[PDB]
Amino acid sequence: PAAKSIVTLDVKPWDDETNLEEMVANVKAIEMEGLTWGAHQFIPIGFGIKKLQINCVVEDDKVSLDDLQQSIEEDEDHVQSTDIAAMQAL
Amino acid sequence: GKEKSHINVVVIGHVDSGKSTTTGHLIYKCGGIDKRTIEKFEKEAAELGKGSFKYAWVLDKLKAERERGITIDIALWKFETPKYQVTVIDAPGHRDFIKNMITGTSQADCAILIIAGGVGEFEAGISKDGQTREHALLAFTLGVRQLIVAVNKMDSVKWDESRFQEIVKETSNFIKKVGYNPKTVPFVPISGWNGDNMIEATTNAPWYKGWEKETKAGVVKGKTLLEAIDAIEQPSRPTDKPLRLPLQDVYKIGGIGTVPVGRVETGVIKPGMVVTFAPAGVTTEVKSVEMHHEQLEQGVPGDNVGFNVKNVSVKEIRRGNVCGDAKNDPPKGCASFNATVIVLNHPGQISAGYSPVLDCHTAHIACRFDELLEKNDRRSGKKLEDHPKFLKSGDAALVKFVPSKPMCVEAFSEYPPLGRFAVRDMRQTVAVGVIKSVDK
Ligand SMILES: Nc1nc2c(ncn2[C@@H]2O[C@H](COP(=O)(O)OP(=O)(O)O)[C@@H](O)[C@H]2O)c(=O)[nH]1
């Protein structure tokens, strides 16, 4: 078995109008060998603004978290930025 | 139960030291993460026999479950002790975790080094080029002064005292070389799998009289790993320190206005205050503060809150900007800043003019290694030479930096969260620095 790490990302929108269902769909549409999307929720952060909090499991020697964050962020119309909420080993 | 103070812990060790099992065991028996999946496998374990089951079995199934990606809870893991609410991190092997261990949220107050008692295993774990030593080195450089050592798999060695002692001496040498003082480190013999000395004292080693450690007020002793965690010394919270809130995002809500978001590293944010956004110099009043669902009358260190302000366009302030009290050491940009850099293992040699990207808190800017001030002895800080011509893996030196874009940073000594940075290059972290002086 290969070494893995479970990661939770924080995907922020542009405002309180950004289609949240569209954001996660585009995120989940991202396919990478060694990447597995998991649970996800919309968490309020203040002023009616909700962020995307999704989990995923990745294979260290295959998936790059940096490149992944860059890929997600290409969704200019929905994504403002990304951050690592937390991460652990497996 | 009772009220508890917060503390962060990071568990490091070789890939087979059994640290995921040790860590998993604590969260399991002392916390509440993914309990649903747990209750699913505890009832299913009735198959294995008549009902009995090893905790490690359930943990094993939970791992496979997460790999499928059907678990609920996220990566933020916590667990309690007779005194502490602990947010733990089972140090990941993934290389992108390095930056996160330096610029991420909540720096550990103590690191637990898990070591396999196995013959060949032990040696392989303490390699000078292993990831374990790198995590230890980073923890040390970043200021994690407390440490716990756990010699796991004591069962595989039949709990032989002599083997335990040799392990302790070699491990003490190993950590000493990193910069840790062994006399302050509790060496706990356990078995992540069988649970010996995890939460209850073992009965497989009559010779074992418990661990102990010297502290500023005397010597503290114990038997279990849990006790060692509970013995972690209370860290100093920068509540009374000036406000520092690095910005993560900025919004514009109709009928509300501009609302930046970020984490309060130090100080307190309240409505009514007059803050300043560095390095821009924007000053405004804090209309209010929200976090999660409610309103907050104030945000303390560690909170990721959102606040509203008027007369400030969202095109004036941005991610990476620092917020603080306009009338209490307020945030400012810098012409440059001097830092202590620790070059990690990597295919290269650094020299003046090198201008990599540096990740300092929420800031992501390329800075120039303008001058190589001096090379120094890592552990003592003593100067070895003036103006070295280059630096290589393992080297520790004082470097003068010059940010290419407007940037705000702090001296680690005053604002830890903004005085430690990661140097990005070669698809990895080639270096870690600590700010020693800033030219504001
Ligand atoms: N004999 C023995 N084996 C253990 C113990 N704890 C864990 N193991 C085994 O050692 C291996 C490595 O453990 P693991 O948690 O995956 O290590 P990590 O990847 O470094 O976190 C696994 O096959 C475990 O079942 C222990 O106390 N005694």
Asked if residue B242 and residue B224 are part of one domain, the reply reads no
Asked if residue B165 and residue B43 are part of one domain, the reply reads yes
The CATH code of domain A1-90 reads 3.30.70.60
Domain boundary among B291, B326, B361: B326
Nearest to B411 by CA among B329, B321, B350, B337: B337
Asked if residue B394 and residue B319 are part of one domain, the reply reads no
- Residue B272: count other Cβ atoms within 10 Å of its Cβ: 9
Instruction: List, in sequence order, every beta strand (DSSP E) within chain A.
Output: 4-12, 35-46, 49-59, 81-89
Asked if residue B435 and residue B386 are part of one domain, the reply reads yes
Domain housing B139: 1-235
Amino acid at A3: A
The pair of three-digit structure tokens given for residue B309, joined into one six-digit string:
């302000």
DSSP secondary structure string for all residues of B159-204: T-HHHHHHHHHHHHHHHHHHT--GGG--EEE-BTTTTBTTTB--SS
Asked if residue B227 and residue B94 are part of one domain, the reply reads yes
**Solved using:** X-ray
Domain limits, chain A: 1-90
Asked if residue B198 and residue B103 are part of one domain, the reply reads yes
Beta carbons of B147 and B186 less than 8 angstroms apart = no
Domain boundary among B190, B207, B235: B235
Compute the half-sphere exposure of residue B283: CA atoms within 13 Å on the CB side of its CA: 10
- Residue B93: count other Cβ atoms within 10 Å of its Cβ: 16
Asked if residue B392 and residue B247 are part of one domain, the reply reads no
Name the residue in chain B with its Cα closest to that of A6.
Answer: B75
B279 CB burial (10 A radius; 0-12, 13-18, 19+): buried
B342 CB burial (10 A radius; 0-12, 13-18, 19+): buried
Chain B CB within 8 Å of residue A20 CB: no
Under 8 Å CB-to-CB from A83, ≥6 apart: which residues? A9, A10, A12, B248
Residues B424 and B428: their CA atoms lie apart, in Å, by 6
Nearest to B390 by CA among B421, B353, B433, B336: B353
Asked if residue B218 and residue B123 are part of one domain, the reply reads yes
Kindly report the CATH number assigned to the domain that includes residue B46: 3.40.50.300
Chain B CB within 8 Å of residue A88 CB: yes
How far is CA B418 from its chain centroid?
14
Asked if residue B409 and residue B302 are part of one domain, the reply reads no
- At B247, phi and psi to the nearest 5? -80, 135
How far is CA B174 from its chain centroid?
21
Asked if residue B39 and residue B183 are part of one domain, the reply reads yes
Chain B CB within 8 Å of residue A7 CB: yes
Q: Do B249 and A81 touch (CB under 8 A)?
A: yes
The pair of three-digit structure tokens given for residue B371, joined into one six-digit string:
């001058």
Q: What is the DSSP letter of B237?
A: P
Nearest CA to ligand 1 atom 17: B18
Under 8 Å CB-to-CB from B255, ≥6 apart: which residues? none
Number of domains within chain B:
3
Residues A42 and B229: their CA atoms lie apart, in Å, by 34
Kindly report the CATH number assigned to the domain that includes residue B306: 2.40.30.10
Residues B274 and B149: their CA atoms lie apart, in Å, by 46
How far is CA A26 from its chain centroid?
10
Asked if residue B125 and residue B173 are part of one domain, the reply reads yes
Resolution of the structure in the document, Å: 2.6
Q: Can you tell me which residue has the tokens 């300043």?
A: B276
| Contacting residues of A for B76, CB less than 8 Å apart | 8, 85-86
Sign of CA dihedral B69, B72, B78, B82: negative
- At A15, phi and psi to the nearest 5? -170, -175
Domain boundary among B235, B262, B297: B235
- Residue B370: count other Cβ atoms within 10 Å of its Cβ: 16
